[PDB]
Design a protein around this nucleic acid. Structure first.
Ligand SMILES: [Mg+2]
Ligand SMILES: [Mg+2]
Ligand SMILES: [Mg+2]
Ligand SMILES: [Mg+2]
Ligand SMILES: [Mg+2]
Ligand SMILES: [Mg+2]
Ligand SMILES: [Mg+2]
Ligand SMILES: [Mg+2]
Ligand SMILES: [Mg+2]
Ligand SMILES: [Mg+2]
Ligand SMILES: [Mg+2]
Ligand SMILES: [Mg+2]
Ligand SMILES: [Mg+2]
Ligand SMILES: [Mg+2]
Ligand SMILES: [Mg+2]
Ligand SMILES: [Mg+2]
Ligand SMILES: [Mg+2]
Ligand SMILES: [Mg+2]
Ligand SMILES: [Mg+2]
Ligand SMILES: [Mg+2]
Ligand SMILES: [Mg+2]
Ligand SMILES: [Mg+2]
Ligand SMILES: [Mg+2]
Ligand SMILES: [Mg+2]
Ligand SMILES: [Mg+2]
Ligand SMILES: [Mg+2]
Ligand SMILES: [Mg+2]
Ligand SMILES: [Mg+2]
Ligand SMILES: [Mg+2]
Ligand SMILES: [Mg+2]
Ligand SMILES: [Mg+2]
Ligand SMILES: [Mg+2]
Ligand SMILES: [Mg+2]
Ligand SMILES: [Mg+2]
Ligand SMILES: [Mg+2]
Ligand SMILES: [Mg+2]
Ligand SMILES: [Mg+2]
Ligand SMILES: [Mg+2]
Ligand SMILES: [Mg+2]
Ligand SMILES: [Mg+2]
Ligand SMILES: [Mg+2]
Ligand SMILES: [Mg+2]
Ligand SMILES: [Mg+2]
Ligand SMILES: [Mg+2]
Ligand SMILES: [Mg+2]
Ligand SMILES: [Mg+2]
Ligand SMILES: [Mg+2]
Ligand SMILES: [Mg+2]
Ligand SMILES: [Mg+2]
Ligand SMILES: [Mg+2]
Ligand SMILES: [Mg+2]
Ligand SMILES: [Mg+2]
Ligand SMILES: [Mg+2]
Ligand SMILES: [Mg+2]
Ligand SMILES: [Mg+2]
Ligand SMILES: [Mg+2]
Ligand SMILES: [Mg+2]
Ligand SMILES: [Mg+2]
Ligand SMILES: [Mg+2]
Ligand SMILES: [Mg+2]
Ligand SMILES: [Mg+2]
Ligand SMILES: [Mg+2]
Ligand SMILES: [Mg+2]
Ligand SMILES: [Mg+2]
Ligand SMILES: [Mg+2]
Ligand SMILES: [Mg+2]
Ligand SMILES: [Mg+2]
Ligand SMILES: [Mg+2]
Ligand SMILES: [Mg+2]
Ligand SMILES: [Mg+2]
Ligand SMILES: [Mg+2]
Ligand SMILES: [Mg+2]
Ligand SMILES: [Mg+2]
Ligand SMILES: [Mg+2]
Ligand SMILES: [Mg+2]
Ligand SMILES: [Mg+2]
Ligand SMILES: [Mg+2]
Ligand SMILES: [Mg+2]
Ligand SMILES: [Mg+2]
Ligand SMILES: [Mg+2]
Ligand SMILES: [Mg+2]
Ligand SMILES: [Mg+2]
Ligand SMILES: [Mg+2]
Ligand SMILES: [Mg+2]
Ligand SMILES: [Mg+2]
Ligand SMILES: [Mg+2]
Ligand SMILES: [Mg+2]
Ligand SMILES: [Mg+2]
Ligand SMILES: [Mg+2]
Ligand SMILES: [Mg+2]
Ligand SMILES: [Mg+2]
Ligand SMILES: [Mg+2]
Ligand SMILES: [Mg+2]
Ligand SMILES: [Mg+2]
Ligand SMILES: [Mg+2]
Ligand SMILES: [Mg+2]
Ligand SMILES: [Mg+2]
Ligand SMILES: [Mg+2]
Ligand SMILES: [Mg+2]
Ligand SMILES: [Mg+2]
Ligand SMILES: [Mg+2]
Ligand SMILES: [Mg+2]
Ligand SMILES: [Mg+2]
Ligand SMILES: [Mg+2]
Ligand SMILES: [Mg+2]
Ligand SMILES: [Mg+2]
Ligand SMILES: [Mg+2]
Ligand SMILES: [Mg+2]
Ligand SMILES: [Mg+2]
Ligand SMILES: [Mg+2]
Ligand SMILES: [Mg+2]
Ligand SMILES: [Mg+2]
Ligand SMILES: [Mg+2]
Ligand SMILES: [Mg+2]
Ligand SMILES: [Mg+2]
Ligand SMILES: [Mg+2]
Ligand SMILES: [Mg+2]
Ligand SMILES: [Mg+2]
Ligand SMILES: [Mg+2]
Ligand SMILES: [Mg+2]
Ligand SMILES: [Mg+2]
Ligand SMILES: [Mg+2]
Ligand SMILES: [Mg+2]
Ligand SMILES: [Mg+2]
Ligand SMILES: [Mg+2]
Ligand SMILES: [Mg+2]
Ligand SMILES: [Mg+2]
Ligand SMILES: [Mg+2]
Ligand SMILES: [Mg+2]
Ligand SMILES: [Mg+2]
Ligand SMILES: [Mg+2]
Ligand SMILES: [Mg+2]
Ligand SMILES: [Mg+2]
Ligand SMILES: [Mg+2]
Ligand SMILES: [Mg+2]
Ligand SMILES: [Mg+2]
Ligand SMILES: [Mg+2]
Ligand SMILES: [Mg+2]
Ligand SMILES: [Mg+2]
Ligand SMILES: [Mg+2]
Ligand SMILES: [Mg+2]
Ligand SMILES: [Mg+2]
Ligand SMILES: [Mg+2]
Ligand SMILES: [Mg+2]
Ligand SMILES: [Mg+2]
Ligand SMILES: [Mg+2]
Ligand SMILES: [Mg+2]
Ligand SMILES: [Mg+2]
Ligand SMILES: [Mg+2]
Ligand SMILES: [Mg+2]
Ligand SMILES: [Mg+2]
Ligand SMILES: [Mg+2]
Ligand SMILES: [Mg+2]
Ligand SMILES: [Mg+2]
Ligand SMILES: [Mg+2]
Ligand SMILES: [Mg+2]
Ligand SMILES: [Mg+2]
Ligand SMILES: [Mg+2]
Ligand SMILES: [Mg+2]
Ligand SMILES: [Mg+2]
Ligand SMILES: [Mg+2]
Ligand SMILES: [Mg+2]
Ligand SMILES: [Mg+2]
Ligand SMILES: [Mg+2]
Ligand SMILES: [Mg+2]
Ligand SMILES: [Mg+2]
Ligand SMILES: [Mg+2]
Ligand SMILES: [Mg+2]
Ligand SMILES: [Mg+2]
Ligand SMILES: [Mg+2]
Ligand SMILES: [Mg+2]
Ligand SMILES: [Mg+2]
Ligand SMILES: [Mg+2]
Ligand SMILES: [Mg+2]
Ligand SMILES: [Mg+2]
Ligand SMILES: [Mg+2]
Ligand SMILES: [Mg+2]
Ligand SMILES: [Mg+2]
Ligand SMILES: [Mg+2]
Ligand SMILES: [Mg+2]
Ligand SMILES: [Mg+2]
Ligand SMILES: [Mg+2]
Ligand SMILES: [Mg+2]
Ligand SMILES: [Mg+2]
Ligand SMILES: [Mg+2]
Ligand SMILES: [Mg+2]
Ligand SMILES: [Mg+2]
Ligand SMILES: [Mg+2]
Ligand SMILES: [Mg+2]
Ligand SMILES: [Mg+2]
Ligand SMILES: [Mg+2]
Ligand SMILES: [Mg+2]
Ligand SMILES: [Mg+2]
Ligand SMILES: [Mg+2]
Ligand SMILES: [Mg+2]
Ligand SMILES: [Mg+2]
Ligand SMILES: [Mg+2]
Ligand SMILES: [Mg+2]
Ligand SMILES: [Mg+2]
Ligand SMILES: [Mg+2]
Ligand SMILES: [Mg+2]
Ligand SMILES: [Mg+2]
Ligand SMILES: [Mg+2]
Ligand SMILES: [Mg+2]
Ligand SMILES: [Mg+2]
Ligand SMILES: [Mg+2]
Ligand SMILES: [Mg+2]
Ligand SMILES: [Mg+2]
Ligand SMILES: [Mg+2]
Ligand SMILES: [Mg+2]
Ligand SMILES: [Mg+2]
Ligand SMILES: [Mg+2]
Ligand SMILES: [Mg+2]
Ligand SMILES: [Mg+2]
Ligand SMILES: [Mg+2]
Ligand SMILES: [Mg+2]
Ligand SMILES: [Mg+2]
Ligand SMILES: [Mg+2]
Ligand SMILES: [Mg+2]
Ligand SMILES: [Mg+2]
Ligand SMILES: [Mg+2]
Ligand SMILES: [Mg+2]
Ligand SMILES: [Mg+2]
Ligand SMILES: [Mg+2]
Ligand SMILES: [Mg+2]
Ligand SMILES: [Mg+2]
Ligand SMILES: [Mg+2]
Ligand SMILES: [Mg+2]
Ligand SMILES: [Mg+2]
Ligand SMILES: [Mg+2]
Ligand SMILES: [Mg+2]
Ligand SMILES: [Mg+2]
Ligand SMILES: [Mg+2]
Ligand SMILES: [Mg+2]
Ligand SMILES: [Mg+2]
Ligand SMILES: [Mg+2]
Ligand SMILES: [Mg+2]
Ligand SMILES: [Mg+2]
Ligand SMILES: [Mg+2]
Ligand SMILES: [Mg+2]
Ligand SMILES: [Mg+2]
Ligand SMILES: [Mg+2]
Ligand SMILES: [Mg+2]
Ligand SMILES: [Mg+2]
Ligand SMILES: [Mg+2]
Ligand SMILES: [Mg+2]
Ligand SMILES: [Mg+2]
Ligand SMILES: [Mg+2]
Ligand SMILES: [Mg+2]
Ligand SMILES: [Mg+2]
Ligand SMILES: [Mg+2]
Ligand SMILES: [Mg+2]
Ligand SMILES: [Mg+2]
Ligand SMILES: [Mg+2]
Ligand SMILES: [Mg+2]
Ligand SMILES: [Mg+2]
Ligand SMILES: [Mg+2]
Ligand SMILES: [Mg+2]
Ligand SMILES: [Mg+2]
Ligand SMILES: [Mg+2]
Ligand SMILES: [Mg+2]
Ligand SMILES: [Mg+2]
Ligand SMILES: [Mg+2]
Ligand SMILES: [Mg+2]
Ligand SMILES: [Mg+2]
Ligand SMILES: [Mg+2]
Ligand SMILES: [Mg+2]
Ligand SMILES: [Mg+2]
Ligand SMILES: [Mg+2]
Ligand SMILES: [Mg+2]
Ligand SMILES: [Mg+2]
Ligand SMILES: [Mg+2]
Ligand SMILES: [Mg+2]
Ligand SMILES: [Mg+2]
Ligand SMILES: [Mg+2]
Ligand SMILES: [Mg+2]
Ligand SMILES: [Mg+2]
Ligand SMILES: [Mg+2]
Ligand SMILES: [Mg+2]
Ligand SMILES: [Mg+2]
Ligand SMILES: [Mg+2]
Ligand SMILES: [Mg+2]
Ligand SMILES: [Mg+2]
Length: 88
RNA sequence: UAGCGGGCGUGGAUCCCUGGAUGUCCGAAUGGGGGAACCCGGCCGGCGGGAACGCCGGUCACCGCGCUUUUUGCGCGGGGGGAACCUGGGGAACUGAAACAUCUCAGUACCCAGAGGAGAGGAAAGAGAAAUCGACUCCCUGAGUAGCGGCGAGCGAAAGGGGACCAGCCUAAACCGUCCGGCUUGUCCGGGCGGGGUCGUGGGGCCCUCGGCAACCGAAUCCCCAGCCUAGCCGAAGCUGUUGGGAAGCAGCGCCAGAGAGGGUGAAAGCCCCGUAGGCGAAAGGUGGGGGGAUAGGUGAGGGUACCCGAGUACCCCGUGGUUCGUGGAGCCAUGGGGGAAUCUGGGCGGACCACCGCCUAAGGCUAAGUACUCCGGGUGACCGAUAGCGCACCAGUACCGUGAGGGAAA
RNA sequence: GCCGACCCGCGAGGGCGGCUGGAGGUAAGGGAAGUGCGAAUGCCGGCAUGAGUAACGAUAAAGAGGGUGAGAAUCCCUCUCGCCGUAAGCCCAAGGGUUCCUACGCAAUGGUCGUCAGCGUAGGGUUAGGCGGGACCUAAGGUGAAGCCGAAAGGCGUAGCCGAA
RNA sequence: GCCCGGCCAGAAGCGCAGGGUGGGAGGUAGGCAAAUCCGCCUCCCAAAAGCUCUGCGUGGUGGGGAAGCCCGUACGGGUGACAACCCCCCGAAGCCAGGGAGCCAAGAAAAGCCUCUAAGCACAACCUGCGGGAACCCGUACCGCAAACCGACACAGGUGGGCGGGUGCAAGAGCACUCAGGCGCGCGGGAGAACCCUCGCCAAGGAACUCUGCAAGUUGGCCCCGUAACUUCGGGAGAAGGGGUGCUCCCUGGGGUGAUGAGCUCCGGGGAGCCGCAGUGAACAGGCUCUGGCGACUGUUUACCAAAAACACAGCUCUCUGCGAACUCGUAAGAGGAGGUAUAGGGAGCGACGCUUGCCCGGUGCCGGAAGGUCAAGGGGAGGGGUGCAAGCCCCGAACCGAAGCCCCGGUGAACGGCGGCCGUAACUAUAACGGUCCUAAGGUAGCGAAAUUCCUUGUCGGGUAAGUUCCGACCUGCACGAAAAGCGUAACGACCGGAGCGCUGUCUCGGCGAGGGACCCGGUGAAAUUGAACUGGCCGUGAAGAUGCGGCCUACCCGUGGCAGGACGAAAAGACCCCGUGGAGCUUUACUGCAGCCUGGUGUUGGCUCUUGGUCGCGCCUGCGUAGGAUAGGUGGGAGCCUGUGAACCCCCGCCUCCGGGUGGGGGGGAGGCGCCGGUGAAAUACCACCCUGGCGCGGCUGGGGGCCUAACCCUCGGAUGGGGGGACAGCGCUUGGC
RNA sequence: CGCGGGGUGGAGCAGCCUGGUAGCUCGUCGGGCUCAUAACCCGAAGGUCGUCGGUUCAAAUCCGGCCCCCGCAACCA
């Protein structure tokens, strides 16, 4: 999948194989395929309870930056789901 | 739709239009189950002697959002369908290349998600050579041009010009006030609300000097009206003879015409009937900027300081998509992976790259009109006339065939 | 539309006359096309040939009297004969869906006939606290809060729920 | 005497027959303890009854109740009884039912039910009994082995469970006949031709038939006698070959029920007779033997032409896999493997069992190999280029460092596979144990052999027959056997294929007669493929080369009915063969190109500590052994003097390198020199100093490799975890690089 | 096409490093020992160390061009 602040989905874009020179010519052989986002689990505490974020490495910090603003946010009550949701 | 058998209507029925009422059961189907149209319940209330049974009324699915002191709840919303049109996510092959693999068919068929009477796009980090144009969309042209291409098959733009339409806006950030939480009291750390602000003649913030504004703009938001729509109404002018089963034909004389469209009437009718020309009409519902009113908004000039101007973004590299561009000298737009800034002496672009000269302000969002379609209503055809025309003129998506998806007549 | 021995044209056709038909037709001159059929094992429909031919669906088998009736080898009744009898009898389940019973009826259906029928028309008929099933239980399996996964559609799946010969 | 019938249900109670069950006391650390229940430990008692549950019988009482006759469409109503309603016997696979024994392949769940306690409650609630009351929804016709369901149809097909009587036969659900009940299959009537179907019989012969004894026939059940090779000792065996079987009377043995018996009933043994052609008098009802091949065997298969020698099989070997297993499906989550753990699981081959399974590792595969060679991105950056006045920006790019793979070095055959050619020789002839030579990775071993393999071929010899392209036995010039695509054998088994013999036969010589169902005639109903049109003959020619249709000649009144099948190049299917098309599809591989998959370097996720080592830049300090000349002078240059005060020529102890001669640098000290000399002289020359090369060491910056430790990401796991344990910066996953 | 390292006696090869060494092995000849044959031992003949130029006192050794061979990688309208 892709979920989280990352935004990033999984783009399907083809890889095309070539034999050649480039300074004599260059020919081909092509087909479809998909690239994935570097998703990664990210644990973090925030208030009570743990909480996790299947997110790309490219936005891992954004999570900790996101927890920073959460501390200043008056929040509580058992709700791991609602935590994450309220965490924007 | 006649028959048996009974009724109603000028105290104005049937009928037409508008609004309301009732609407078993299934179906997004929503109390639960389920082999759709069936079965079984919780809670509150009612009925039957009514505890046991049964019926009746109300209520109870799930998800999102905002509250709610949390709990339990309350409120707003969603769900499914739609002929084609629209956007997006995925996305073939036959075929063409007279084989075939790049390429083609094609981002087509189709699958999926979503939107609406439209959808999309849209206020330049644009175009590209004029120191020029000034959102977007659609038509003509430019143009089969530029160019792409096993430079094969074949594909194929844009600027500009002629037209349709015409509209422009809101934010984020600095900065000020407030509330809540935090510490190590600071124009402080975070969060919510309001004020402030919104741009390329670069703008804004904060300071100093002048109106300390009446004014002038003004809606895409409201409200009133015209108008139109969903029933209707008025509407000119001909008689005699004659043949005929039947006059509208034939013969004589006559009239109307803003009406001599058409249909019907036993045959061929301007004047027989319904109409036609031209006029009139709504208690009720829908529509309504075309006109009018109102509000929401919105606006000046210098000087100073260097506070702010959208980040894993720009930018570079790797792998790709889009474009006329098939790796090509390959920019530009987009982005899966890696490295990774600055805030206007800042950044992007004008086809590698560098200098010069110019253009434009990315990383937030909204916007009517011109455009597409035809389930539905009307009008018209050098359109068919029952083997035609929709598959169906008719009791047809039926009969019948198939486990099913599905096929599908005749009349 | 049917007919002609007639007229005109080289011909494709045109015209005339007679009969049928019963409500439309469209000169000269021009315009536009779904415009001419004998063959496509063409398409649809009708009708022929084979032909009064093959066949009438198990070689378990018939006969007679009486009755009904427009009509009887075929319907009813009686007697005689034959056939099945781990069935060719009897009772459940599934599937079928009024074929059940009563009366009336023979156009069609019945491979002949038909007065008969599983056929036509009308009327009636299916009664449960104890049978079966549900207001009980679970199986495979299905579904599926929670959870996990997937471009979308969706896949996996705990509790629960559904599911019986 | 014949014929008809001589029962059904039933609460309590009673009785017969079974099912289930230990009782009491104490202790308790388990049943995610809450328990007085369960479990576990201990003691005592009876060890059986008691208790509980079911079946069967009985049981107040209720129900039913035949033949025959009269009336009768149907259908029953009476008669018809006041009906009788009892005894014995056989006896289930069903009941008592969770009965019993043995066996291995080890045989659902949940609720009801009972018990225990929690919350809670105890004015409740729960249990037993009694009274009064309450008890909804759906199905319910009819068909249902078939005319009502599935097959387009009143279709000779298909469709799961139960009852399914009597008699006879070894027994039975078999076969024959028959109850109850049901039916005579929805066209008939005649005829008694050919021909076809189904059936019976046949003189003499008896496989001569034929590809083949195809088919048919022979035999059949039960009892007794009797029975070979071979064998894995189970078999072969129903071997083979024979005898008996009916009825009658007499004598007689055993079991069951009852009572030890009468009767009933089951199983027999002995003797004497009787009749027929024939006694399991009809119907179920093996013909037999020898000998090869193949496959061990039961089993499986091409629904609709193949049932086999094919598949499978128990078993043998190879190989993968240490568990989050390998492998399989899935994009993933996951699932299978397996709730299994190397005596397990996956893949492959061979295919009971017996005796065996030889040589070749050169190529191919797979396995091992810290060297080396080649190699991608990436690192590096000598050097080069574009542009600008410039600081810069941009680009190209060598050396060197980079993984799998490939090369290379080995191993490996129950891994793919392979397992020779020529010439000569033994006082007959023939042959060749022996030899020569060429090539190979190695040259086919055992055993088998004109074979399910043998082309020549009907090889040759023997056997069998009168006669044998087949069959068996044997030779071996094996076109073209051969050892787990196993080799050679093997008892038993086979709707397997080959050869023979006995018995018996219409297979035949060789046909005949008879029966029924059709064909034929009459009445009723009434198709089909096919069809250019037809007024459709023979011969000999002719013609696209095979004429009813052309020519010549011959022949032939018109129309049919039953038959035959030579022609109409008959009907059917736009040839399945062949070719063609720059057709199609399935399959193969060291065809091409790709994709999945897997391997792999870099990098993100990715962190802490420490040791070691390399590249490179910089700074410091060092090593450098040819003449003469005075040196045994790393390269070069200035340079007369100058340097030793940053204190001279120069004396003892330590570190390091080594060409063993010495260089050089650390701890205390001496005292003013060192070298130079055009002389001398070498390519160029000696003070000191400076830069520089060859390699080394120390310090620092950028940067790469390797080892160990750690934990906190990440993965696994643990009766909740904010956590403990395990792995661990690996793995997994994103992007990218090469390879298979 | 670029990159990498080779040529030395009759044959194979060290020495190249970093300058003062041409060696080894078999082969050929003589001799020693021997049934024979090798083994062993002694001695010996034989190389501008590819070519032409270059630095050097002195190289095959360091340098430049080139001849030829071997190998590496790439391309092939
Ligand atoms: Mg993903
Ligand atoms: Mg991203
Ligand atoms: Mg994309
Ligand atoms: Mg690629
Ligand atoms: Mg290619
Ligand atoms: Mg993490
Ligand atoms: Mg964690
Ligand atoms: Mg990061
Ligand atoms: Mg990053
Ligand atoms: Mg970030
Ligand atoms: Mg809470
Ligand atoms: Mg909330
Ligand atoms: Mg009416
Ligand atoms: Mg009145
Ligand atoms: Mg009225
Ligand atoms: Mg109502
Ligand atoms: Mg609701
Ligand atoms: Mg239902
Ligand atoms: Mg009452
Ligand atoms: Mg009540
Ligand atoms: Mg109700
Ligand atoms: Mg949701
Ligand atoms: Mg609010
Ligand atoms: Mg609350
Ligand atoms: Mg709370
Ligand atoms: Mg609402
Ligand atoms: Mg519609
Ligand atoms: Mg084309
Ligand atoms: Mg073509
Ligand atoms: Mg082709
Ligand atoms: Mg395209
Ligand atoms: Mg598109
Ligand atoms: Mg959606
Ligand atoms: Mg919508
Ligand atoms: Mg709208
Ligand atoms: Mg658009
Ligand atoms: Mg210019
Ligand atoms: Mg312009
Ligand atoms: Mg502008
Ligand atoms: Mg546009
Ligand atoms: Mg348009
Ligand atoms: Mg236009
Ligand atoms: Mg060209
Ligand atoms: Mg071409
Ligand atoms: Mg327009
Ligand atoms: Mg217009
Ligand atoms: Mg607080
Ligand atoms: Mg803050
Ligand atoms: Mg406006
Ligand atoms: Mg109206
Ligand atoms: Mg008027
Ligand atoms: Mg008058
Ligand atoms: Mg008139
Ligand atoms: Mg007239
Ligand atoms: Mg007229
Ligand atoms: Mg007219
Ligand atoms: Mg008219
Ligand atoms: Mg008007
Ligand atoms: Mg009106
Ligand atoms: Mg009103
Ligand atoms: Mg309306
Ligand atoms: Mg309207
Ligand atoms: Mg107005
Ligand atoms: Mg105002
Ligand atoms: Mg930032
Ligand atoms: Mg920022
Ligand atoms: Mg971003
Ligand atoms: Mg790359
Ligand atoms: Mg190209
Ligand atoms: Mg392209
Ligand atoms: Mg090009
Ligand atoms: Mg550029
Ligand atoms: Mg990116
Ligand atoms: Mg900057
Ligand atoms: Mg850009
Ligand atoms: Mg530009
Ligand atoms: Mg470039
Ligand atoms: Mg621009
Ligand atoms: Mg933003
Ligand atoms: Mg019609
Ligand atoms: Mg239609
Ligand atoms: Mg049609
Ligand atoms: Mg219609
Ligand atoms: Mg209807
Ligand atoms: Mg209709
Ligand atoms: Mg049709
Ligand atoms: Mg005439
Ligand atoms: Mg005439
Ligand atoms: Mg003419
Ligand atoms: Mg006309
Ligand atoms: Mg014309
Ligand atoms: Mg046409
Ligand atoms: Mg034709
Ligand atoms: Mg028709
Ligand atoms: Mg018709
Ligand atoms: Mg006809
Ligand atoms: Mg006929
Ligand atoms: Mg006849
Ligand atoms: Mg018939
Ligand atoms: Mg028939
Ligand atoms: Mg009579
Ligand atoms: Mg009559
Ligand atoms: Mg009959
Ligand atoms: Mg049976
Ligand atoms: Mg039925
Ligand atoms: Mg039915
Ligand atoms: Mg009839
Ligand atoms: Mg009839
Ligand atoms: Mg009929
Ligand atoms: Mg029939
Ligand atoms: Mg009759
Ligand atoms: Mg009658
Ligand atoms: Mg009735
Ligand atoms: Mg049942
Ligand atoms: Mg109830
Ligand atoms: Mg996608
Ligand atoms: Mg799961
Ligand atoms: Mg799960
Ligand atoms: Mg009797
Ligand atoms: Mg214990
Ligand atoms: Mg417990
Ligand atoms: Mg305890
Ligand atoms: Mg107790
Ligand atoms: Mg005791
Ligand atoms: Mg007792
Ligand atoms: Mg007792
Ligand atoms: Mg009981
Ligand atoms: Mg009786
Ligand atoms: Mg009587
Ligand atoms: Mg009578
Ligand atoms: Mg009676
Ligand atoms: Mg009596
Ligand atoms: Mg007695
Ligand atoms: Mg038994
Ligand atoms: Mg039992
Ligand atoms: Mg038991
Ligand atoms: Mg068990
Ligand atoms: Mg108990
Ligand atoms: Mg209490
Ligand atoms: Mg009841
Ligand atoms: Mg109920
Ligand atoms: Mg129901
Ligand atoms: Mg019933
Ligand atoms: Mg049957
Ligand atoms: Mg059957
Ligand atoms: Mg039936
Ligand atoms: Mg039926
Ligand atoms: Mg029948
Ligand atoms: Mg059949
Ligand atoms: Mg069936
Ligand atoms: Mg069944
Ligand atoms: Mg009986
Ligand atoms: Mg028997
Ligand atoms: Mg028997
Ligand atoms: Mg017996
Ligand atoms: Mg018997
Ligand atoms: Mg039968
Ligand atoms: Mg007759
Ligand atoms: Mg006869
Ligand atoms: Mg006869
Ligand atoms: Mg027979
Ligand atoms: Mg006989
Ligand atoms: Mg004989
Ligand atoms: Mg023969
Ligand atoms: Mg045969
Ligand atoms: Mg034969
Ligand atoms: Mg025989
Ligand atoms: Mg014997
Ligand atoms: Mg013997
Ligand atoms: Mg034994
Ligand atoms: Mg035997
Ligand atoms: Mg004997
Ligand atoms: Mg007898
Ligand atoms: Mg005895
Ligand atoms: Mg017997
Ligand atoms: Mg017999
Ligand atoms: Mg037998
Ligand atoms: Mg037999
Ligand atoms: Mg015999
Ligand atoms: Mg014998
Ligand atoms: Mg054989
Ligand atoms: Mg065997
Ligand atoms: Mg076997
Ligand atoms: Mg067996
Ligand atoms: Mg068997
Ligand atoms: Mg088949
Ligand atoms: Mg056959
Ligand atoms: Mg068989
Ligand atoms: Mg076989
Ligand atoms: Mg098979
Ligand atoms: Mg074995
Ligand atoms: Mg393996
Ligand atoms: Mg593991
Ligand atoms: Mg584990
Ligand atoms: Mg398991
Ligand atoms: Mg196992
Ligand atoms: Mg051997
Ligand atoms: Mg050997
Ligand atoms: Mg090998
Ligand atoms: Mg080897
Ligand atoms: Mg292999
Ligand atoms: Mg190496
Ligand atoms: Mg350089
Ligand atoms: Mg240069
Ligand atoms: Mg730059
Ligand atoms: Mg590496
Ligand atoms: Mg190689
Ligand atoms: Mg093997
Ligand atoms: Mg080989
Ligand atoms: Mg053999
Ligand atoms: Mg032989
Ligand atoms: Mg032979
Ligand atoms: Mg064989
Ligand atoms: Mg054979
Ligand atoms: Mg052979
Ligand atoms: Mg030959
Ligand atoms: Mg041959
Ligand atoms: Mg032969
Ligand atoms: Mg032969
Ligand atoms: Mg012979
Ligand atoms: Mg002989
Ligand atoms: Mg031999
Ligand atoms: Mg020979
Ligand atoms: Mg052979
Ligand atoms: Mg052999
Ligand atoms: Mg045996
Ligand atoms: Mg067999
Ligand atoms: Mg004999
Ligand atoms: Mg004869
Ligand atoms: Mg006979
Ligand atoms: Mg006859
Ligand atoms: Mg002749
Ligand atoms: Mg001719
Ligand atoms: Mg001929
Ligand atoms: Mg002629
Ligand atoms: Mg003739
Ligand atoms: Mg005749
Ligand atoms: Mg013939
Ligand atoms: Mg052939
Ligand atoms: Mg052809
Ligand atoms: Mg052709
Ligand atoms: Mg070709
Ligand atoms: Mg061609
Ligand atoms: Mg083709
Ligand atoms: Mg290959
Ligand atoms: Mg290969
Ligand atoms: Mg592919
Ligand atoms: Mg180092
Ligand atoms: Mg010298
Ligand atoms: Mg010297
Ligand atoms: Mg000298
Ligand atoms: Mg010396
Ligand atoms: Mg020295
Ligand atoms: Mg020196
Ligand atoms: Mg001294
Ligand atoms: Mg010391
Ligand atoms: Mg010394
Ligand atoms: Mg010293
Ligand atoms: Mg000292
Ligand atoms: Mg002293
Ligand atoms: Mg001293
Ligand atoms: Mg000199
Ligand atoms: Mg000096
Ligand atoms: Mg100096
Ligand atoms: Mg130098
Ligand atoms: Mg350092
Ligand atoms: Mg655990
Ligand atoms: Mg925590
Ligand atoms: Mg992951
Ligand atoms: Mg391989
Ligand atoms: Mg390989
Ligand atoms: Mg090149
Ligand atoms: Mg070249
Ligand atoms: Mg070259
Ligand atoms: Mg190299
Ligand atoms: Mg020599
Ligand atoms: Mg020798
Ligand atoms: Mg020389
Ligand atoms: Mg020399
Ligand atoms: Mg020379
Ligand atoms: Mg190389
Ligand atoms: Mg090249
Ligand atoms: Mg080449």
């Amino acid at each position: 999948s892709g979920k989280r602040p990352i935004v990033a989905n999984s783009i399907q874009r083809r890889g095309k194989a070539k034999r050649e020179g480039g300074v004599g010519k260059k020919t081909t052989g092509i087909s479809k395929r998909r690239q994935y986002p570097n998703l990664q689990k990210v644990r973090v505490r925030v208030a009570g309870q743990e909480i996790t974020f299947r997110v790309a490495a490219s936005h891992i910090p954004k999570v900790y930056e996101l927890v920073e603003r959460a501390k200043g946010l008056r929040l509580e009550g058992l709700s791991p789901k609602e935590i994450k949701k309220e965490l924007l």
